[PDB]
Amino acid sequence: SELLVNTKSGKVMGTRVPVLSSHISAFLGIPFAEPPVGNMRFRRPEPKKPWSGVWNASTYPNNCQQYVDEQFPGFSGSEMWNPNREMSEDCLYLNIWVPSPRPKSTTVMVWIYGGGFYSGSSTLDVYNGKYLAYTEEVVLVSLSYRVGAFGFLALHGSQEAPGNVGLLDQRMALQWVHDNIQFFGGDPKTVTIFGESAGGASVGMHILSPGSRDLFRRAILQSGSPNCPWASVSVAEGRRRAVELGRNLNCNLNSDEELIHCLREKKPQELIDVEWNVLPFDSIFRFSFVPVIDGEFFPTSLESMLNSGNFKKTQILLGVNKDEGSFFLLYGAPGFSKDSESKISREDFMSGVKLSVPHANDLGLDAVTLQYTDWMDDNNGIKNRDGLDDIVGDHNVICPLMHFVNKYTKFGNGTYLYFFNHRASNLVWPEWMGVIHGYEIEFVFGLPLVKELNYTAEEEALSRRIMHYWATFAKTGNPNEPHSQESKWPLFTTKEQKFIDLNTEPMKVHQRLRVQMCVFWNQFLPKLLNAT
Amino acid sequence: SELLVNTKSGKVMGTRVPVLSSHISAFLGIPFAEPPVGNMRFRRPEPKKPWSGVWNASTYPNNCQQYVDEQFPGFSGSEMWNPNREMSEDCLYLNIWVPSPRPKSTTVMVWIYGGGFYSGSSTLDVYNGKYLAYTEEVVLVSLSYRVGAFGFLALHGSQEAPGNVGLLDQRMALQWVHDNIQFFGGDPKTVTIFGESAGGASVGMHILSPGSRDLFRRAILQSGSPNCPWASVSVAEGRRRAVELGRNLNCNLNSDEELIHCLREKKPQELIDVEWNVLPFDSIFRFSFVPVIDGEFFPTSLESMLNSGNFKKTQILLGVNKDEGSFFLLYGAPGFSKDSESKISREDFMSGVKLSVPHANDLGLDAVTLQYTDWMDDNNGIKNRDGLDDIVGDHNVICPLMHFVNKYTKFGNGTYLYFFNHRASNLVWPEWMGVIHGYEIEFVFGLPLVKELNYTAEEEALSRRIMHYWATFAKTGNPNEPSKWPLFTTKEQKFIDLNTEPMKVHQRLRVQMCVFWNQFLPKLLNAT
Ligand SMILES: *[C@@H]1O[C@H](CO)[C@@H](O)[C@H](O)[C@H]1NC(C)=O
Ligand SMILES: *[C@@H]1O[C@H](CO)[C@@H](O)[C@H](O)[C@H]1NC(C)=O
Ligand SMILES: *[C@@H]1O[C@H](CO)[C@@H](O)[C@H](O)[C@H]1NC(C)=O
Ligand SMILES: *[C@@H]1O[C@H](CO)[C@@H](O)[C@H](O)[C@H]1NC(C)=O
Ligand SMILES: *[C@](C)(O)CCC[N+](C)(C)C
Ligand SMILES: *[C@](C)(O)CCC[N+](C)(C)C
Ligand SMILES: C[C@H](O)CCC[N+](C)(C)C
Ligand SMILES: C[C@H](O)CCC[N+](C)(C)C
Ligand SMILES: [Cl-]
Ligand SMILES: [Cl-]
Ligand SMILES: [Cl-]
Ligand SMILES: [Cl-]
């Protein structure tokens, strides 16, 4: 019985799911931790205790409690990222797709959804793992972790709300794959962890954290890295926000114990409703509760760890999308609209930069402005719009990732960098937004392979080669297949710093992805803000 | 006689000179002040006392005492700027070229040579005023003024060496023209002063000085403005440098009188020998003795004066050359040579910027570096060379002039801006230096009009339209006669290229870099 598997915690019963004229096995909603409810809220996850009988694993599980986006009701472009299942604090489950017949000991890929650490689900349609697992014959795992206050509230010192529990939820799911995936036909010695945005930052954090290192073989980071400005906060800022949350709910602030006890008596939706009120300034691409540099999950500052090579040394494949910042400008910056060309006046441009670099002083602001302003034509609405898009994307995603890739490669054993710049022919978002943050995921999971989705033939071929790059990399540590005729994705080296564009046109090799801007963001601006 | 003129100080006998198969009158070496020698060194100029008899004005006068460039002996490119006659402290004279027959109340143009305030002569071949005076039929005057310590040693408080005497010398020459040009066929009410580099900065300073304003009608500034970073120092820096001069010569530094008396006993060449030893940093495009903001010649800071509109309001015609910085990189920056392409390594680039912005801190240097480095190819020697070239030109000439043009236009009565970017065909300097600082002068003075100089027919035509723009402007306030050189406005900020090709109108001359040098950097250095 392919569907009846017995794990270390009890038996589980999957289901036969159809896929591209064929079929595969699916195990949906398998628990890997105890429900972090009641007195468990904010606390480190605990291993799921053994159960008797057969666990029905044929339906998706609940999604964690989170802020839901209602900016555009009925609009698929945004609602495809919202929970598609009932939310509940009892959400620590994982899904698995296994080729049929069951492989013996094949490659395993574990997906970690993104969503700024304040949202995300393992059950979205865009994350349906059946297409990838089937086409590349890999065992695909989809995990989950607590988001928002529930997974990242941090009061350093306390053991009730220590912080980073969401990262620990992820670790426990990987520990489960390590101990049980063999029963599903996967080789636990060859597991690749891959994620996008907050997911990509997570993958990068496991690479740095000593406690996660032995739980996976290789890693793929898509549009996200550990050192991003939004991916973490100090213990001090974490406490400030934690104490600010209590104040917003008239909580007793006399002690961590009383504060935490107060926050535990509250209903999920009560914490969520005030979540954004704890932020330092008016801003965009900034999230209230994220990982904290505690000295535990993270030994020392992320920067010193990268400079000293204190991290798992292996092969990594990572990259970014052409327009990482448009999605966030649309939601929180003046002048942007989904139903318009969004030409930004000079006044709105200024407001946007302030919004994008909230931590900067007046001098740092002038520096940013000058760096992205064409003074021969400053009132050009289009240049001002695209300018802000580049600012937001470079500061928050692209440049932090380049910093990471350059630091990593000095110690790693094989780096591959990509630049995704293909605008899907069926995108429901406006043309000015370009290649949007997160829209490369549908190609990674093979959505283009299904006819009724209406992707072009060239997009299907692109999807097929991207999945092949990902899987092959997962299996061997090299996205290329030896002695093959197709163009080769070259290694990224400290010297030549090569990378390829990922699109429907023949491969192109480039060098130094946005070096000019990243020098500004990674070297110059910090020195400037550090002055006084 | 057409050559014998009676001025308010005495008679002068000129000389009939040949010019382009014709002739004109020339009155060379006319004294406009008393010889500033002996106890008069460092002191304000005093008017030339009347003389009996006829003053022989047939030959050029002596040039003032100055540092002489001996970097390239025999090489015409550098020597054409050196004194072409005996140097002496008694050097306050002027030259005049009058068309023949003597016109009536015609337009007058007064030339003020450049040279960083440490050098220059009115007698240089390239400043021969006969071609311009004849061709455009104007009375051309070229004056002289003390340079170096002799003309700019500043010891605010003292009246034996108060500072700015070189500018005061220029003022006395203009005053002299104001009272005597009429006797030469010139119109004292229609005088245009023009000069290059330090000469351009001087013109700008007269526009700002209350005591100079009534001495001229219009102004032309070529590659220089009063606000350039090298054109002036504070009273404190002036005194510090002055005292360091004494120290270098082992002078009594107990008081100003003692210091001055000591410095007045030294031979001219002794001072000149240690002149460069008083600069505060290792640098380029920086000079020891320059004008000082004393509160007298200059009421308040140049900036506050520019913002409040406290200055002469008239028409101005100013501009710059395409490669203002190459000449100074060649003399003081590592990696540069006259006999090679001069590809600049990365290390030399870094050395260069530090040399170019001596006052900036490390953050400021990184700012300049990032602003001029193409990181997709930083080890490119040609790009590093051109970057340093632009750095020196933008910081010292182009951007300070643009800041001036924008401030002046808000209160002025007409601005005309130009960008000179034509490379002379007979230039003796290497190609990497491009359109060099000061080489537009030869075009302004009509040198291309003489065959023996081997210029191209296209360049001669260029020289003719430049001389006509300059002259027509001087006489009406508009370079165009009734392609038109558009007026520069606060709104459109238009300017024209000046070359052998049909005119082209542009807008915002190097606005990107000048926003960096006029707004960002200043603010950054003040904050850190
Ligand atoms: C498992 O759940 C699915 C979906 O409701 C159902 O079809 C199936 O019969 C269940 N299996 C059992 C017997 O629990
Ligand atoms: C990875 O490590 C192996 C063994 O240490 C070495 O042979 C190989 O060259 C390395 N690969 C890269 C690209 O660093
Ligand atoms: C004026 O001086 C020149 C040069 O010394 C001399 O040739 C000329 O004869 C003098 N003028 C006269 C004729 O007195
Ligand atoms: C110059 O001033 C006159 C008289 O005030 C004025 O009529 C004219 O418009 C001004 N010209 C310019 C270009 O400012
Ligand atoms: C990243 C900040 O985690 C953002 C991911 C957001 N979606 C919309 C692509 C899921
Ligand atoms: C200006 C700094 O006064 C420099 C003038 C240089 N020459 C060589 C053109 C005289
Ligand atoms: C990234 C995102 O759309 C933020 C959610 C909107 N606010 C901050 C207004 C609640
Ligand atoms: C351009 C010029 O001759 C610079 C002056 C050179 N030193 C300092 C050596 C005297
Ligand atoms: Cl970088
Ligand atoms: Cl001749
Ligand atoms: Cl001589
Ligand atoms: Cl105007």
Side-chain angles (χ1 to χ4, degrees):
Chain A
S1 182
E2 281 184 298
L3 310 177
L4 183 41
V5 180
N6 46 68
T7 80
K8 264 87 156 58
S9 299
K11 308 190 189 75
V12 162
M13 176 68 105
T15 173
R16 178 113 56 272
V17 301
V19 59
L20 307 172
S21 300
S22 186
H23 303 71
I24 62 170
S25 303
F27 301 74
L28 316 172
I30 298 177
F32 63 76
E34 287 289 293
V37 299
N39 63 85
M40 303 287 271
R41 184 187 287 170
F42 305 131
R43 200 170 304 179
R44 297 193 174 77
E46 211 70 34
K48 173 62 169 187
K49 40 194 58 178
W51 66 81
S52 303
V54 181
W55 185 292
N56 191 327
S58 62
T59 78
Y60 276 138
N62 299 312
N63 297 151
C64 298
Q65 292 288 168
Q66 54 189 279
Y67 167 87
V68 179
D69 166 39
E70 291 163 355
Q71 264 295 178
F72 309 115
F75 190 58
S76 64
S78 59
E79 301 184 308
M80 67 182 268
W81 303 105
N82 293 323
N84 55 324
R85 290 287 177 294
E86 169 176 63
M87 299 183 277
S88 165
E89 269 183 283
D90 175 27
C91 58
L92 297 183
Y93 303 74
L94 54 79
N95 312 301
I96 312 181
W97 286 273
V98 180
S100 185
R102 180 187 309 179
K104 273 186 176 298
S105 180
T106 191
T107 311
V108 182
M109 294 175 82
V110 179
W111 177 252
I112 303 172
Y113 60 70
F117 289 120
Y118 71 87
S119 56
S121 302
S122 64
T123 62
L124 303 181
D125 306 318
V126 68
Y127 301 157
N128 195 326
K130 74 180 183 178
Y131 303 105
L132 177 56
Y134 172 85
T135 304
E136 296 301 306
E137 299 186 57
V138 301
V139 171
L140 187 48
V141 175
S142 179
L143 53 71
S144 61
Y145 59 102
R146 291 170 282 172
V147 297
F150 307 95
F152 298 96
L153 175 79
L155 287 175
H156 198 57
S158 165
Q159 303 300 310
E160 299 298 347
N164 295 321
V165 298
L167 285 174
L168 292 175
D169 292 331
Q170 289 173 15
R171 180 181 288 175
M172 193 141 90
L174 296 174
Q175 177 65 61
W176 184 97
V177 172
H178 178 268
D179 302 331
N180 299 287
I181 203 66
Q182 65 192 65
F183 308 125
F184 297 81
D187 170 23
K189 300 175 78 303
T190 314
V191 50
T192 289
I193 57 170
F194 68 134
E196 188 269 330
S197 201
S202 290
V203 165
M205 294 174 158
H206 289 292
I207 288 186
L208 298 177
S209 167
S212 299
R213 300 189 189 177
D214 304 301
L215 294 180
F216 61 102
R217 179 62 172 298
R218 288 183 268 283
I220 300 182
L221 305 82
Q222 312 178 193
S223 304
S225 57
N227 57 310
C228 290
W230 49 268
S232 73
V233 300
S234 61
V235 296
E237 174 60 10
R239 168 172 292 289
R240 223 218 68 254
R241 297 184 188 187
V243 173
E244 188 61 11
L245 179 61
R247 196 181 68 62
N248 270 275
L249 312 158
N250 301 304
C251 272
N252 179 305
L253 309 174
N254 300 301
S255 71
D256 297 328
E257 295 77 5
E258 304 171 64
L259 168 56
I260 296 172
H261 174 287
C262 181
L263 298 175
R264 288 181 174 169
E265 293 292 3
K266 305 295 179 173
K267 285 190 166 190
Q269 200 56 50
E270 293 189 70
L271 276 52
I272 303 179
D273 279 324
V274 292
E275 188 187 304
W276 309 87
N277 298 339
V278 309
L279 284 182
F281 325 96
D282 285 352
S283 64
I284 57 174
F285 221 129
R286 287 296 176 287
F287 318 115
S288 294
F289 302 98
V290 299
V292 290
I293 302 302
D294 59 0
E296 177 176 50
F297 185 100
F298 292 110
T300 72
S301 71
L302 302 180
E303 189 51 39
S304 67
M305 286 184 84
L306 291 169
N307 296 327
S308 63
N310 171 38
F311 53 76
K312 196 189 166 60
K313 284 94 170 176
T314 193
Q315 305 91 53
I316 59 171
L317 178 157
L318 72 183
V320 300
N321 290 8
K322 175 168 150 284
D323 301 281
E324 295 292 343
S326 64
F327 177 94
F328 301 87
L329 287 172
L330 168 64
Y331 282 68
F336 293 94
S337 165
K338 182 170 73 71
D339 312 303
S340 165
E341 202 175 4
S342 297
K343 295 176 175 177
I344 306 301
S345 73
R346 198 62 197 161
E347 194 186 302
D348 287 340
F349 181 77
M350 300 284 78
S351 300
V353 307
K354 176 67 171 172
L355 259 53
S356 305
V357 193
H359 53 295
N361 55 32
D362 195 57
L363 187 69
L365 292 175
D366 295 335
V368 176
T369 298
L370 179 58
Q371 189 76 177
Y372 287 87
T373 298
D374 181 349
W375 283 111
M376 285 184 269
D377 186 35
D378 53 296
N379 290 295
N380 183 310
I382 289 177
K383 289 181 177 174
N384 294 321
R385 176 195 68 202
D386 296 336
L388 237 49
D389 173 55
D390 286 316
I391 288 184
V392 172
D394 293 339
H395 175 53
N396 296 289
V397 183
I398 300 176
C399 289
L401 183 145
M402 290 317 298
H403 184 69
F404 176 72
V405 71
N406 278 292
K407 289 290 184 176
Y408 189 80
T409 300
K410 301 294 291 178
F411 292 100
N413 185 250
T415 300
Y416 296 86
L417 183 58
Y418 76 72
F419 187 68
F420 187 79
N421 59 348
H422 176 72
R423 159 94 176 184
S425 61
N426 58 20
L427 210 68
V428 295
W429 289 101
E431 188 79 41
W432 71 265
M433 297 180 85
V435 191
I436 310 172
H437 177 65
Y439 283 70
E440 83 287 354
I441 299 178
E442 47 202 57
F443 285 80
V444 171
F445 282 77
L447 282 282
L449 283 64
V450 22
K451 271 296 181 179
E452 56 276 15
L453 290 197
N454 290 170
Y455 283 82
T456 63
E458 19 288 306
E459 292 173 311
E460 191 191 314
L462 174 61
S463 179
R464 286 182 177 289
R465 54 184 288 259
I466 286 178
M467 290 192 289
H468 196 61
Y469 283 150
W470 265 227
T472 303
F473 168 76
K475 308 197 190 73
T476 68
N478 185 330
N480 301 302
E481 298 196 306
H483 55 65
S484 70
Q485 293 63 64
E486 295 120 309
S487 57
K488 296 292 184 299
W489 181 333
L491 272 166
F492 173 95
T493 65
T494 168
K495 182 184 181 60
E496 289 149 56
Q497 301 161 54
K498 299 178 176 178
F499 77 90
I500 60 165
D501 290 332
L502 227 30
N503 53 50
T504 54
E505 300 181 308
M507 182 180 293
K508 294 186 176 71
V509 177
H510 298 299
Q511 295 188 200
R512 303 201 183 188
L513 172 44
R514 297 186 67 76
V515 278
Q516 200 62 36
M517 294 301 92
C518 294
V519 167
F520 173 85
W521 292 109
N522 300 319
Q523 298 175 52
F524 183 67
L525 192 56
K527 285 196 61 179
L528 186 162
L529 298 174
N530 177 57
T532 183
Chain B
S1 184
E2 192 184 9
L3 298 175
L4 205 186
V5 182
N6 302 57
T7 68
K8 300 189 182 306
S9 286
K11 299 172 181 171
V12 299
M13 181 64 87
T15 166
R16 191 150 185 284
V17 297
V19 50
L20 303 172
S21 65
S22 185
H23 310 70
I24 67 172
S25 307
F27 305 77
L28 311 177
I30 295 175
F32 67 75
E34 282 291 292
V37 295
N39 269 49
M40 295 187 80
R41 183 184 289 172
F42 308 127
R43 207 179 292 172
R44 292 190 173 69
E46 222 67 58
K48 173 62 176 183
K49 285 184 289 300
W51 61 83
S52 53
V54 182
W55 190 289
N56 185 323
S58 75
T59 63
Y60 279 130
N62 291 309
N63 300 139
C64 300
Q65 292 287 182
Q66 55 189 282
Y67 165 82
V68 183
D69 171 41
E70 298 167 52
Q71 264 287 173
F72 307 115
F75 180 50
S76 60
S78 61
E79 247 136 44
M80 67 184 262
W81 304 106
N82 291 333
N84 57 339
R85 23 195 64 276
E86 230 62 285
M87 292 188 280
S88 168
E89 276 188 272
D90 167 38
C91 61
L92 302 189
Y93 302 81
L94 54 74
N95 309 288
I96 311 176
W97 283 272
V98 191
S100 181
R102 179 185 302 169
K104 301 174 61 179
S105 183
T106 189
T107 305
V108 182
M109 292 176 88
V110 180
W111 177 248
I112 308 179
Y113 60 69
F117 291 115
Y118 71 85
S119 62
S121 297
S122 72
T123 62
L124 300 188
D125 289 12
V126 292
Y127 302 155
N128 189 326
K130 64 179 178 174
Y131 310 104
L132 175 55
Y134 170 82
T135 305
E136 294 301 304
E137 314 196 72
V138 299
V139 173
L140 190 59
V141 173
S142 63
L143 54 81
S144 65
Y145 58 100
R146 285 171 284 174
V147 297
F150 303 107
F152 296 97
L153 185 85
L155 285 174
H156 194 51
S158 159
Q159 290 303 305
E160 287 296 294
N164 293 322
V165 301
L167 286 174
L168 287 173
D169 293 336
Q170 307 183 336
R171 179 183 289 175
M172 194 159 288
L174 297 173
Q175 176 66 57
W176 185 94
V177 183
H178 181 279
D179 307 320
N180 303 283
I181 201 59
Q182 65 196 61
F183 306 134
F184 295 79
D187 175 1
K189 301 182 90 304
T190 312
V191 168
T192 292
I193 56 177
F194 68 129
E196 188 266 342
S197 202
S202 286
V203 166
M205 298 172 164
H206 286 303
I207 283 179
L208 296 174
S209 186
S212 297
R213 296 181 200 158
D214 301 308
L215 295 181
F216 66 102
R217 184 63 175 295
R218 302 175 226 289
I220 293 184
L221 300 73
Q222 305 170 196
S223 301
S225 54
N227 54 306
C228 286
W230 51 266
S232 79
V233 299
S234 61
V235 294
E237 177 67 39
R239 172 175 294 286
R240 203 226 86 222
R241 295 187 183 181
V243 173
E244 185 65 17
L245 190 63
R247 171 175 299 91
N248 270 278
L249 301 171
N250 282 298
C251 272
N252 187 309
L253 309 180
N254 287 316
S255 74
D256 302 333
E257 277 298 313
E258 303 191 67
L259 172 56
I260 296 180
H261 293 316
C262 179
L263 294 177
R264 279 178 171 162
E265 312 309 347
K266 335 299 290 186
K267 300 182 181 181
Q269 199 60 61
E270 292 185 67
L271 278 51
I272 296 172
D273 287 325
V274 297
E275 187 186 315
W276 307 95
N277 299 356
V278 308
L279 286 172
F281 313 112
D282 291 303
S283 68
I284 60 174
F285 219 131
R286 286 295 176 285
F287 321 110
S288 296
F289 302 98
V290 298
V292 292
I293 305 305
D294 58 353
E296 180 175 47
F297 183 98
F298 293 112
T300 58
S301 66
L302 299 174
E303 191 66 304
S304 73
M305 286 184 86
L306 283 174
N307 289 318
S308 63
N310 172 31
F311 56 72
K312 187 185 175 65
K313 298 171 188 58
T314 181
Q315 300 79 51
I316 53 174
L317 182 151
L318 63 191
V320 301
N321 286 8
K322 182 186 180 190
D323 306 289
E324 303 284 0
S326 55
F327 193 98
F328 298 92
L329 282 164
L330 174 56
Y331 280 70
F336 295 92
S337 167
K338 188 180 69 62
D339 313 302
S340 69
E341 301 185 72
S342 300
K343 295 166 180 295
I344 305 305
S345 78
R346 193 66 203 160
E347 171 171 285
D348 283 349
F349 179 81
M350 237 59 268
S351 290
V353 320
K354 171 65 166 182
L355 254 29
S356 305
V357 191
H359 51 296
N361 47 39
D362 303 295
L363 186 63
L365 297 178
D366 293 340
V368 177
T369 301
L370 175 53
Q371 183 75 185
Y372 287 90
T373 298
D374 160 29
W375 282 108
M376 288 183 80
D377 176 38
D378 58 302
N379 285 306
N380 180 154
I382 286 187
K383 282 174 175 169
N384 287 327
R385 180 193 66 196
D386 294 9
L388 229 41
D389 182 65
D390 286 314
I391 285 172
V392 180
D394 291 338
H395 174 57
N396 295 292
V397 183
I398 304 185
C399 294
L401 179 142
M402 291 310 299
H403 178 74
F404 179 76
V405 76
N406 284 305
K407 288 292 182 184
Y408 190 84
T409 303
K410 292 178 181 300
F411 295 101
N413 194 218
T415 299
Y416 296 92
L417 178 62
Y418 75 76
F419 186 76
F420 189 86
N421 62 349
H422 171 65
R423 162 90 179 185
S425 60
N426 53 30
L427 219 299
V428 300
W429 294 98
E431 278 179 47
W432 74 261
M433 291 179 71
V435 187
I436 313 179
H437 173 73
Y439 281 73
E440 86 288 350
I441 294 174
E442 47 192 61
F443 281 83
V444 168
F445 279 76
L447 273 304
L449 298 234
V450 40
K451 320 301 97 167
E452 314 96 65
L453 299 189
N454 303 309
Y455 282 77
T456 69
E458 290 68 47
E459 293 173 310
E460 183 186 304
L462 171 59
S463 179
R464 284 178 180 288
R465 49 185 288 249
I466 286 176
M467 287 193 285
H468 196 55
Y469 286 144
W470 267 232
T472 299
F473 171 75
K475 50 191 61 175
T476 71
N478 181 318
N480 305 295
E481 284 192 299
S483 300
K484 290 199 178 307
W485 187 331
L487 198 53
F488 174 98
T489 68
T490 304
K491 174 70 85 72
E492 291 174 291
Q493 307 167 55
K494 298 179 175 181
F495 74 89
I496 67 168
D497 282 321
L498 221 42
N499 52 57
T500 63
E501 297 195 304
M503 178 183 273
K504 294 292 298 182
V505 175
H506 296 293
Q507 301 187 196
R508 307 185 173 190
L509 173 53
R510 292 182 75 64
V511 59
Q512 198 68 47
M513 293 305 100
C514 291
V515 167
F516 173 79
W517 295 105
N518 294 331
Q519 289 193 291
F520 187 66
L521 191 61
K523 190 156 175 292
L524 177 153
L525 294 174
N526 180 63
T528 66

